PDB file of C-alpha atoms and ligand atoms in Angstrom:
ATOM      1  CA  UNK A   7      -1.566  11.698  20.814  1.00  0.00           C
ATOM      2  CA  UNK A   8       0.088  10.233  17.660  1.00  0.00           C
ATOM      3  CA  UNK A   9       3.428  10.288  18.906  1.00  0.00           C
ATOM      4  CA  UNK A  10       5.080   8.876  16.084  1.00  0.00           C
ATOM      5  CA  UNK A  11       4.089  12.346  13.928  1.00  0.00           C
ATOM      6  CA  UNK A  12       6.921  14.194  16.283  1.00  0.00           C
ATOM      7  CA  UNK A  13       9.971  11.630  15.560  1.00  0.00           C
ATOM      8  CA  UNK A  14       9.419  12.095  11.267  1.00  0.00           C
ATOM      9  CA  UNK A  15      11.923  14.896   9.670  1.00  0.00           C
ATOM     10  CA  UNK A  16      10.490  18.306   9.998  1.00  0.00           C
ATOM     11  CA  UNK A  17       9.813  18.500   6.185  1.00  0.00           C
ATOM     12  CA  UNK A  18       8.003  15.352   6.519  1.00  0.00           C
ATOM     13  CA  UNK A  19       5.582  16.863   8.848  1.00  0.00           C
ATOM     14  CA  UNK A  20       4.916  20.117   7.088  1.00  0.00           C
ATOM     15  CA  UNK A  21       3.451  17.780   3.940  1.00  0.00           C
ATOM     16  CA  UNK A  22       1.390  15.214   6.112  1.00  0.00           C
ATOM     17  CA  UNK A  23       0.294  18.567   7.930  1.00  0.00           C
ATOM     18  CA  UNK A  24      -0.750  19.779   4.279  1.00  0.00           C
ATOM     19  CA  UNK A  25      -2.126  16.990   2.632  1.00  0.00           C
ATOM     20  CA  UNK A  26      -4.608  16.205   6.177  1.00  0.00           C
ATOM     21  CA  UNK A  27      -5.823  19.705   5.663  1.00  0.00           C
ATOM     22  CA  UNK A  28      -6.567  19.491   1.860  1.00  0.00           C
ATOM     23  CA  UNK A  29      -8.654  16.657   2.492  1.00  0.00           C
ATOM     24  CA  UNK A  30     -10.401  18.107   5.806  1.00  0.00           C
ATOM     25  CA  UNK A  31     -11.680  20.848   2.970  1.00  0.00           C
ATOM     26  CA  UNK A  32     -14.061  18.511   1.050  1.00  0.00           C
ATOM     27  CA  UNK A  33     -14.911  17.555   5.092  1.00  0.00           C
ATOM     28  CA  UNK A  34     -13.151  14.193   5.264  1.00  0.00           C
ATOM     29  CA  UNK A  35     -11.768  14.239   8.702  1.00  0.00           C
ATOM     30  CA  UNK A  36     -10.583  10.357   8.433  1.00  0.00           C
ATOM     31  CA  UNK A  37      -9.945   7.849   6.263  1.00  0.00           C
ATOM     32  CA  UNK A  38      -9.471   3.955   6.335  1.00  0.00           C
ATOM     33  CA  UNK A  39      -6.635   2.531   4.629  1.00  0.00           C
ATOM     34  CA  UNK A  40      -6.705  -1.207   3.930  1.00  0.00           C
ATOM     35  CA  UNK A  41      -3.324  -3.214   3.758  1.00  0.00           C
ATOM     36  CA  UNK A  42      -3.383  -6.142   1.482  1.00  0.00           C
ATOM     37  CA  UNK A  43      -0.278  -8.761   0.297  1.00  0.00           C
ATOM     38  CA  UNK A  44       1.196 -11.626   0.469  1.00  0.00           C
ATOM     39  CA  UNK A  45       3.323 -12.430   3.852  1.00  0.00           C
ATOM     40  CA  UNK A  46       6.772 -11.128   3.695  1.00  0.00           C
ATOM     41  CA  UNK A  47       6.507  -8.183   1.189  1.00  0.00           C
ATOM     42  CA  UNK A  48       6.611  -5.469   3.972  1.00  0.00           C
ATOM     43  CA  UNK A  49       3.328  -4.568   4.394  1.00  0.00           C
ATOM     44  CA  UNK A  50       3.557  -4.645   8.868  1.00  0.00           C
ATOM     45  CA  UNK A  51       6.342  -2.621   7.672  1.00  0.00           C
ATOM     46  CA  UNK A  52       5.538   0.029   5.888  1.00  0.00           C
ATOM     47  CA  UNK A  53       2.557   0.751   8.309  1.00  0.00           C
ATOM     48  CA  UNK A  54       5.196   1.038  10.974  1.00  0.00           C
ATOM     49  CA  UNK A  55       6.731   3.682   8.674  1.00  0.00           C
ATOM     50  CA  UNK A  56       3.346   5.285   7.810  1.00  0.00           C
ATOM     51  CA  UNK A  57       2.472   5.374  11.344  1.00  0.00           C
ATOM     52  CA  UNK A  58       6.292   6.722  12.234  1.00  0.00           C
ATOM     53  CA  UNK A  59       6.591   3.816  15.003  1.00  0.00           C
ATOM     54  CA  UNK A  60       6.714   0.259  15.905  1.00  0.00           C
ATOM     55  CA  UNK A  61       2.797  -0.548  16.151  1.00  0.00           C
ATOM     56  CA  UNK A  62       2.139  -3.836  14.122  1.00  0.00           C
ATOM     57  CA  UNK A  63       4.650  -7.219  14.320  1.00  0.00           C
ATOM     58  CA  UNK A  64       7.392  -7.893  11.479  1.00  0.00           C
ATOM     59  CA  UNK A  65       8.170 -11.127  10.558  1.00  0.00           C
ATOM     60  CA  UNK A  66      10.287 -13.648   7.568  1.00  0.00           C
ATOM     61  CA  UNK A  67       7.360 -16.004   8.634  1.00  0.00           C
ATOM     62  CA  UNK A  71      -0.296 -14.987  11.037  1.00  0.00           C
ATOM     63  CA  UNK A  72      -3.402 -14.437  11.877  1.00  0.00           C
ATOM     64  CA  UNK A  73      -6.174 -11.458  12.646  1.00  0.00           C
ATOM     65  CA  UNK A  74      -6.164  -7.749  11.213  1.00  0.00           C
ATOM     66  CA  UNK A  75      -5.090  -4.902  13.384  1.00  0.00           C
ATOM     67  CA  UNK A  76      -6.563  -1.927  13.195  1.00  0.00           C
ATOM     68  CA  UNK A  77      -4.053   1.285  13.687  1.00  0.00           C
ATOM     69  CA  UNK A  78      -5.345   4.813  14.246  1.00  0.00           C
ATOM     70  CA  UNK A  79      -4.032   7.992  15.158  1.00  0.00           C
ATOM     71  CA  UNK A  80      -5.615  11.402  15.277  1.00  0.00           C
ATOM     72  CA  UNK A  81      -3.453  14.816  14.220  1.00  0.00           C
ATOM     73  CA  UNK A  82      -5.064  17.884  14.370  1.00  0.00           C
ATOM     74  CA  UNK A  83      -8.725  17.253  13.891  1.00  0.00           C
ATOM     75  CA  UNK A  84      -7.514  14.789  11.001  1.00  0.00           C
ATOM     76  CA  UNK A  85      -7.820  10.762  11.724  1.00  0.00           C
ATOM     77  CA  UNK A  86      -5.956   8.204   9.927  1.00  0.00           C
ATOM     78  CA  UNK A  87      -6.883   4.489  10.274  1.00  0.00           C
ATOM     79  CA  UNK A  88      -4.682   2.214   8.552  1.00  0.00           C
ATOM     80  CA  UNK A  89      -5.923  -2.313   8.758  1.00  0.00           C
ATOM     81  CA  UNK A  90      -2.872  -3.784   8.127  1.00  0.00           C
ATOM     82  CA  UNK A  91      -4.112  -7.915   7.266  1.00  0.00           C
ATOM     83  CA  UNK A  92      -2.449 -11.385   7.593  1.00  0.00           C
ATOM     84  CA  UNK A  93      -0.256 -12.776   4.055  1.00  0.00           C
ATOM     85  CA  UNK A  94      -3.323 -14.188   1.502  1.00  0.00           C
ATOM     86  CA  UNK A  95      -0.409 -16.675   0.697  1.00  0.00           C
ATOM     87  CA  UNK A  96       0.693 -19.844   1.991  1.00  0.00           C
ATOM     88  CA  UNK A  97       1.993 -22.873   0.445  1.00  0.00           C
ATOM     89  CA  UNK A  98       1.970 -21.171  -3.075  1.00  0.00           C
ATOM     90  CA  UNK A  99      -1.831 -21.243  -2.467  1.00  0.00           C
ATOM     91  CA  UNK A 100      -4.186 -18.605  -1.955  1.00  0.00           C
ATOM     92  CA  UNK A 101      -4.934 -18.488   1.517  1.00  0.00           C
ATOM     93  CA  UNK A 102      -8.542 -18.292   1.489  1.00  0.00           C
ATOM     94  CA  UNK A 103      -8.879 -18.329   5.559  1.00  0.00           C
ATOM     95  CA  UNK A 104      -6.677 -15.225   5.900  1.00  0.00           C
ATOM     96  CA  UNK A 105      -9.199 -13.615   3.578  1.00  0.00           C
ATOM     97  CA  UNK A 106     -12.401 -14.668   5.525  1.00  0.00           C
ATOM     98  CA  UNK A 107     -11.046 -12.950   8.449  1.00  0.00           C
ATOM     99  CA  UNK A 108      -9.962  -9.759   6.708  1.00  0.00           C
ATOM    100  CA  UNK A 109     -13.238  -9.886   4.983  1.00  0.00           C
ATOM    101  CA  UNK A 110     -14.596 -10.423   8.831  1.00  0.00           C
ATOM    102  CA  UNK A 111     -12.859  -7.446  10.113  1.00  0.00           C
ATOM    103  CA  UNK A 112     -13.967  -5.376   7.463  1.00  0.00           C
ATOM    104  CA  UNK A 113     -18.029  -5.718   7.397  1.00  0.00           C
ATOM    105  CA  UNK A 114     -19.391  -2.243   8.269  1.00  0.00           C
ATOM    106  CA  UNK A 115     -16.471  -0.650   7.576  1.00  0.00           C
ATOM    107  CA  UNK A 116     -15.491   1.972   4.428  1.00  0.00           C
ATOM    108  CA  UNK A 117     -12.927   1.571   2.938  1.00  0.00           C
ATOM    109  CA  UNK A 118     -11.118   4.456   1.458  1.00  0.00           C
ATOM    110  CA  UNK A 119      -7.977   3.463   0.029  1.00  0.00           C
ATOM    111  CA  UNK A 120      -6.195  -0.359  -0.763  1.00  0.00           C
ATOM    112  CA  UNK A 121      -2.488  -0.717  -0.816  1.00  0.00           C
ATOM    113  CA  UNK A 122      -1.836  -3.712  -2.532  1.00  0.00           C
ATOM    114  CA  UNK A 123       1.903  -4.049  -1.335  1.00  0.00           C
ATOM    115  CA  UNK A 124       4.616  -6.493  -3.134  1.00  0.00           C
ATOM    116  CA  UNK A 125       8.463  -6.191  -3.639  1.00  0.00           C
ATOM    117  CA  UNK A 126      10.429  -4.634  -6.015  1.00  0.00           C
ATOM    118  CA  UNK A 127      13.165  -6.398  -5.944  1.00  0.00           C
ATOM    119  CA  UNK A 128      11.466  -9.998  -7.350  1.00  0.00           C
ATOM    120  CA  UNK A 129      12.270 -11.158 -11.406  1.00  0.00           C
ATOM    121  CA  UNK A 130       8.652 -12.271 -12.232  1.00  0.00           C
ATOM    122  CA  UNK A 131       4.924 -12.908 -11.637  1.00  0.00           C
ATOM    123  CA  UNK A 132       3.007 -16.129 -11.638  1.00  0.00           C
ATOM    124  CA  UNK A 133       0.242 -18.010 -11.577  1.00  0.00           C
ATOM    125  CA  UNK A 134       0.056 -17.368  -7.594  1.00  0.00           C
ATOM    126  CA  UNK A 135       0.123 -13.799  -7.658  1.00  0.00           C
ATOM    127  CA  UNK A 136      -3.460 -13.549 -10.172  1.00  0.00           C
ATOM    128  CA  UNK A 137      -4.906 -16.462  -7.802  1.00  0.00           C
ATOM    129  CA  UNK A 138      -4.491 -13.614  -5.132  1.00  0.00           C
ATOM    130  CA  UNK A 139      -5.564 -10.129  -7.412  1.00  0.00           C
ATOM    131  CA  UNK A 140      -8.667 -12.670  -8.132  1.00  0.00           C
ATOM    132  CA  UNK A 141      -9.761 -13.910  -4.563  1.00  0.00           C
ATOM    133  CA  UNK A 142      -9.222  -9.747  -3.740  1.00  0.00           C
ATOM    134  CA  UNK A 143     -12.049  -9.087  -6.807  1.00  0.00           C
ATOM    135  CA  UNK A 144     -13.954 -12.004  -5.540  1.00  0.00           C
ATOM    136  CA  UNK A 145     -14.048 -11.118  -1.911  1.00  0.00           C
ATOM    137  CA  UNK A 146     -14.687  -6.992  -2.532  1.00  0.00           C
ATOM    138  CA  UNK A 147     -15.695  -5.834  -5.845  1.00  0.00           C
ATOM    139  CA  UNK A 148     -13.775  -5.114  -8.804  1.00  0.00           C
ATOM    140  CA  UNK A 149     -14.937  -1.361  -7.488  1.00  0.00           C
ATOM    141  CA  UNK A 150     -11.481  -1.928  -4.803  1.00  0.00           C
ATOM    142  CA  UNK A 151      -9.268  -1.517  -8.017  1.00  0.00           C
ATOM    143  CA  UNK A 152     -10.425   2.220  -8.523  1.00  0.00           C
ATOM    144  CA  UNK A 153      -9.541   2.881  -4.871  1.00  0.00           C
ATOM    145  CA  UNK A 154      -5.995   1.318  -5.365  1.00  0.00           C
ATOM    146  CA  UNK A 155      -2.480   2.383  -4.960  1.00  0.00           C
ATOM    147  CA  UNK A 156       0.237  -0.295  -5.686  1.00  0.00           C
ATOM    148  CA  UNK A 157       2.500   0.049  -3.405  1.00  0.00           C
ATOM    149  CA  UNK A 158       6.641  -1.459  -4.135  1.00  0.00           C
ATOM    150  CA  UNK A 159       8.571  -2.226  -1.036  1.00  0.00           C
ATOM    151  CA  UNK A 160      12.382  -2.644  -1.085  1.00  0.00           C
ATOM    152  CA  UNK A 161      13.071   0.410  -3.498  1.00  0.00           C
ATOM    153  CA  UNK A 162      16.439   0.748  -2.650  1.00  0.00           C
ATOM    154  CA  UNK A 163      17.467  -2.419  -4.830  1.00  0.00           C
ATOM    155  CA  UNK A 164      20.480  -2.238  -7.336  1.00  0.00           C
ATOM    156  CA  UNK A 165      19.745  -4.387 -10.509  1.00  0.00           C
ATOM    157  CA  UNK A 166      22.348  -7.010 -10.551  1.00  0.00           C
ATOM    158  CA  UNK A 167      22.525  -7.518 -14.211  1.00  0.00           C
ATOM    159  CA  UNK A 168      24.183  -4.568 -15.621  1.00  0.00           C
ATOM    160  CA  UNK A 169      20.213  -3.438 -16.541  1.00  0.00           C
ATOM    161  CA  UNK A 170      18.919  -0.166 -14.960  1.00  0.00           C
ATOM    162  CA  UNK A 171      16.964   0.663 -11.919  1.00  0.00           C
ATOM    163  CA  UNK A 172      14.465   2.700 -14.157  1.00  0.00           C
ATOM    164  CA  UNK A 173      14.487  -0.230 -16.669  1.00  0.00           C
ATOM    165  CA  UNK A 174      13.923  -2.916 -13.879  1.00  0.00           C
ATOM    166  CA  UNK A 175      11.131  -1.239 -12.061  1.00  0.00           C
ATOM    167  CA  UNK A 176       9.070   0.237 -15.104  1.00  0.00           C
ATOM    168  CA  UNK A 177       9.036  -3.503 -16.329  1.00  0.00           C
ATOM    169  CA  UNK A 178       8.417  -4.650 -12.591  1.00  0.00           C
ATOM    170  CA  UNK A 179       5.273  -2.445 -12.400  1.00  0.00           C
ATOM    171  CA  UNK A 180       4.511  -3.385 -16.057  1.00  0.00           C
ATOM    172  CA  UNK A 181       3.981  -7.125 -14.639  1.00  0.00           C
ATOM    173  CA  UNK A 182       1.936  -6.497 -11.736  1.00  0.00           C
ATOM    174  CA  UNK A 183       0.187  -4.226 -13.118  1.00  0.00           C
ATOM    175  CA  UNK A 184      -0.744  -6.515 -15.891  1.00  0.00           C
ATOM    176  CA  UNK A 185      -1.261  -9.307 -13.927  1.00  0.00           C
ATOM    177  CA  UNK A 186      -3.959  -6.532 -11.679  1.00  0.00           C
ATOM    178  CA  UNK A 187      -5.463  -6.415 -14.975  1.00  0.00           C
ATOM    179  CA  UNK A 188      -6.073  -9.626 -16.664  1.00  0.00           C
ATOM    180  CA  UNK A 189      -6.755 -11.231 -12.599  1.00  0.00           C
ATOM    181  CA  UNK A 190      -9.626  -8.672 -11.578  1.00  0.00           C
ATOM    182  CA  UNK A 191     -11.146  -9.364 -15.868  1.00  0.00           C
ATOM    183  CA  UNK A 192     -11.247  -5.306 -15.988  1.00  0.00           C
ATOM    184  CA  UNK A 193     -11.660  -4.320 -19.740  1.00  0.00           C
ATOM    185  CA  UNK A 194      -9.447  -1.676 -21.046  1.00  0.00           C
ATOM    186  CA  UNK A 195     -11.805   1.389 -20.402  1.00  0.00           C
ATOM    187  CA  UNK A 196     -12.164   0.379 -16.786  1.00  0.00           C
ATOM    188  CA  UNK A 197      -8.717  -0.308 -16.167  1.00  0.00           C
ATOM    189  CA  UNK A 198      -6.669   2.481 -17.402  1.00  0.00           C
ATOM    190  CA  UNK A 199     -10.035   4.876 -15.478  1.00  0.00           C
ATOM    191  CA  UNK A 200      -8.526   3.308 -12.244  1.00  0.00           C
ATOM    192  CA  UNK A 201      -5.571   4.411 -13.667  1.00  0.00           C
ATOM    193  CA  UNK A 202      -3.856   2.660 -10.726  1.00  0.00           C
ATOM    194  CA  UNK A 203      -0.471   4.572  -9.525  1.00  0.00           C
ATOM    195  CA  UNK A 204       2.945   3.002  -8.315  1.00  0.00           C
ATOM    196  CA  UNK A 205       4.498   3.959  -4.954  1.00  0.00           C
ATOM    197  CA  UNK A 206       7.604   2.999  -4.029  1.00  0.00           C
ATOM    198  CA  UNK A 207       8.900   2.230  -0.335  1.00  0.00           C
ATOM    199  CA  UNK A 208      11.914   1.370   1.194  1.00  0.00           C
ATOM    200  CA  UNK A 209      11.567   0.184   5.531  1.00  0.00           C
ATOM    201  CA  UNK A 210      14.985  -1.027   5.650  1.00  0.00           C
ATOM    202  CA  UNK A 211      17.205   1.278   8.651  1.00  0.00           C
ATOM    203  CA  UNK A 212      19.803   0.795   5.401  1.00  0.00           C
ATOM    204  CA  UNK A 213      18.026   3.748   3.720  1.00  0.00           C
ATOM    205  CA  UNK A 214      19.898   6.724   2.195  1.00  0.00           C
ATOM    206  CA  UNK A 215      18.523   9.937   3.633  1.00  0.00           C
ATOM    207  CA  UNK A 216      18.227  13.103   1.672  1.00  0.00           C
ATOM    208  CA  UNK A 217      19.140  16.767   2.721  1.00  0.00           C
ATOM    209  CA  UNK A 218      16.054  17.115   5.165  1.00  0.00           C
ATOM    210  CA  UNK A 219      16.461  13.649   7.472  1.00  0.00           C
ATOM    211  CA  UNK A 220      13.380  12.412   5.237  1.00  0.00           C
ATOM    212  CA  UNK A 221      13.713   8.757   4.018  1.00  0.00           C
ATOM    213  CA  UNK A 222      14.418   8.886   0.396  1.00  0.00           C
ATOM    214  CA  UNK A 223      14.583   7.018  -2.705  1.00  0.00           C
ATOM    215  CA  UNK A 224      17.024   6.239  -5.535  1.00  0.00           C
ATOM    216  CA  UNK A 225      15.793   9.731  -6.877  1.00  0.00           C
ATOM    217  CA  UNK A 226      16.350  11.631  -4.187  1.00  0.00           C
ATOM    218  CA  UNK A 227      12.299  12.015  -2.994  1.00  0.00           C
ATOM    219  CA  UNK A 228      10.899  11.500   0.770  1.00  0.00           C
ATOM    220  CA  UNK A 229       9.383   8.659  -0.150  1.00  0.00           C
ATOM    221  CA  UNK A 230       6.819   8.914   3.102  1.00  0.00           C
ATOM    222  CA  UNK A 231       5.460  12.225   1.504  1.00  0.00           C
ATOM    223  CA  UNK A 232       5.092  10.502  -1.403  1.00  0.00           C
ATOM    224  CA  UNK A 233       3.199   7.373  -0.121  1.00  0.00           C
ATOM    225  CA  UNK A 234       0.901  10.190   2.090  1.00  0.00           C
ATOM    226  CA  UNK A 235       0.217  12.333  -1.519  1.00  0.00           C
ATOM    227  CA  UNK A 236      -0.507   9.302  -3.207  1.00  0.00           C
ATOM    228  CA  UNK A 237      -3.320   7.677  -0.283  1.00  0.00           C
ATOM    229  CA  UNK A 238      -4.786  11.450   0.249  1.00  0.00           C
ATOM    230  CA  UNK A 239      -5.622  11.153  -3.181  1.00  0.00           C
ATOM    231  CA  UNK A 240      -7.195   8.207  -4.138  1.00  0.00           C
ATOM    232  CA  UNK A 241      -9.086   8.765  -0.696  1.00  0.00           C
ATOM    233  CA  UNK A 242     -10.118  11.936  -2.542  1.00  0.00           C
ATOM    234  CA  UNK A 243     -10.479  10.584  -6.230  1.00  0.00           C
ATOM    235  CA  UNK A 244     -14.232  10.618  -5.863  1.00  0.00           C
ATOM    236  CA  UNK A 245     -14.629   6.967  -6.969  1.00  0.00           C
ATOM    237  CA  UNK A 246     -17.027   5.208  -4.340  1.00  0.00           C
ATOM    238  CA  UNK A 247     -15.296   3.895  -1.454  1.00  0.00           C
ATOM    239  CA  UNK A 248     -15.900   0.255  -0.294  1.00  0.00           C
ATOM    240  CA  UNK A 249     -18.492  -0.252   2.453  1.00  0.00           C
ATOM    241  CA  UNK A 250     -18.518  -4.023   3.326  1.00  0.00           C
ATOM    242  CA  UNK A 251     -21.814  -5.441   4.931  1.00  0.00           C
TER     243      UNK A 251
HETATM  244  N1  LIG B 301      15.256  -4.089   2.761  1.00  0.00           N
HETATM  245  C1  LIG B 301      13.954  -4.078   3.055  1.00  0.00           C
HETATM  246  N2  LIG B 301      13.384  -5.036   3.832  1.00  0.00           N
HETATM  247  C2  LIG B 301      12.048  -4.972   4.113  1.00  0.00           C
HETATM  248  C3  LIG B 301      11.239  -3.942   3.604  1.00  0.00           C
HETATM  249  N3  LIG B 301       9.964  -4.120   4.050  1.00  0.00           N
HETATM  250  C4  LIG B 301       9.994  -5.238   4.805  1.00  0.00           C
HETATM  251  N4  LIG B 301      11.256  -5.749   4.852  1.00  0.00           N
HETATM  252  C5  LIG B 301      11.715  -6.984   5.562  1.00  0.00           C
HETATM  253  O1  LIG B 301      10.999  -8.150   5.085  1.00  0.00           O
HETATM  254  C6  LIG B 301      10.541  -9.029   6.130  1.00  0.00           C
HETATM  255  C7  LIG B 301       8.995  -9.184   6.092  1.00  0.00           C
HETATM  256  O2  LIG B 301       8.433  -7.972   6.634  1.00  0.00           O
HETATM  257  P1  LIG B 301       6.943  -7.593   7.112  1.00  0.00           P
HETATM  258  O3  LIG B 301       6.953  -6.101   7.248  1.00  0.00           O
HETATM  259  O4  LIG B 301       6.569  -8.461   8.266  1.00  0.00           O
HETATM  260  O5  LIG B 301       5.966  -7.974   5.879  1.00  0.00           O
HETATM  261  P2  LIG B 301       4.574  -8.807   5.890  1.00  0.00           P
HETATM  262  O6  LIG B 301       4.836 -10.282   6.133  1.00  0.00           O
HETATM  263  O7  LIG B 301       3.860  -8.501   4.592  1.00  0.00           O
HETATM  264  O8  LIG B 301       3.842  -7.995   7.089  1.00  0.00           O
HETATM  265  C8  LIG B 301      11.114  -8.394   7.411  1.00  0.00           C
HETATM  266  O9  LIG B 301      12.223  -9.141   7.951  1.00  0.00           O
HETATM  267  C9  LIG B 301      11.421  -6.928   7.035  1.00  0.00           C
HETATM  268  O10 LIG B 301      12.465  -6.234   7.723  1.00  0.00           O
HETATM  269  C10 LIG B 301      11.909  -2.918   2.734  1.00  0.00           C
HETATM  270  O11 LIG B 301      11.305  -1.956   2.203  1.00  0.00           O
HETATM  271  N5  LIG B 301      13.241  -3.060   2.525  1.00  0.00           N
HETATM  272 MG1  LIG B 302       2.431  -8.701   8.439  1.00  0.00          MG
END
């Protein structure tokens, strides 16, 4: 049983319910999510969320991936969530030899690359880490990604909007996918890479249906669900590892 599917909101059921059964039409009856971040951006988190209960450690501070699957009605969801690729402001390159480890005859279906929203730029750190990620699995991982925001529920400080903040937030990373993984334009904007937004905090407003929802009022677990079904779906080639 996956018992966290009974404790979501019962609107948040009847669209994971949905978008399992549009992808058990092209006869996918699982799919393999892969986790990927630097440490402390929420990415145990969110699979806790995903997964609707407390399966993976959460932590402000390693060091083998965990595999998390739970079956719902004929439909199978695996989600790996990884150790941080980050530590001392270097690329952990370790961390990546075991995820890399893990991984080996394995597909993978869909990548969350997870980071925070609530951060005011992008270094030279965070393409050291979209570039050992290209390295390690193919530039052919970047078609099969979702970019996934954590801590959505920030409030600008600045007296600058949460649309403005977060479009140019995106903008950055996105950017900084880009010039890290040496796409050229044709091949990057044919990923055409979306942005998810999450928010794990117990802090988080609820809308009219119990569902966890964002600054726009959305279920933001839905969303995230819509968003992997798809790319898991896009008909790009997944990633075997061997
Ligand atoms: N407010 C808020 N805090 C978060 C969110 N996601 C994670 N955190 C917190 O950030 C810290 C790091 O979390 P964790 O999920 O372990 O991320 P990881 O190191 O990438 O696995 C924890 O103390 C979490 O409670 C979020 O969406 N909102
Ligand atoms: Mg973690």
């Amino acid at each position: 049983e996956w018992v966290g599917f009974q404790q979501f909101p019962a609107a948040t059921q009847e669209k994971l319910i949905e978008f399992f059964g549009k992808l058990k039409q092209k006869d996918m009856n699982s799919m393999t999510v892969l986790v990927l971040g630097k440490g402390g951006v929420g990415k145990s988190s969110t699979v806790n969320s995903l997964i609707g209960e407390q399966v993976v450690r959460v932590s402000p501070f390693g060091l083998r991936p965990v595999m998390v699957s739970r079956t719902m009605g004929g439909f199978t969801i695996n989600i790996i969530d990884t150790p941080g690729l980050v530590e001392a402001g270097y690329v952990n390159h370790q961390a990546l030899e075991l995820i890399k480890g893990f991984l080996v005859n394995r597909t993978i279906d869909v990548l969350l690359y997870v980071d925070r929203l609530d951060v005011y730029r992008v270094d030279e750190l965070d393409k050291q880490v979209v570039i050992a990620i290209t390295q390690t699995f193919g530039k052919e991982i970047w078609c099969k990604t979702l970019l996934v925001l954590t801590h959505a529920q920030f409030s600008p400080p600045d007296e600058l909007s949460y649309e403005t903040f977060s479009s140019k937030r995106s903008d950055s990373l996105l950017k900084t996918i880009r010039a890290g993984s040496k796409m050229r334009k044709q091949e990057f904007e044919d990923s055409a890479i979306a942005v998810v937004y999450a928010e794990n905090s117990g802090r988080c407003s609820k809308n009219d249906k119990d569902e966890k929802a964002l600054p726009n009022g959305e279920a933001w677990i839905p969303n995230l669900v819509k968003a992997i079904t798809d790319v898991a779906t896009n008909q790009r080639k997944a990633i075997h590892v061997d």
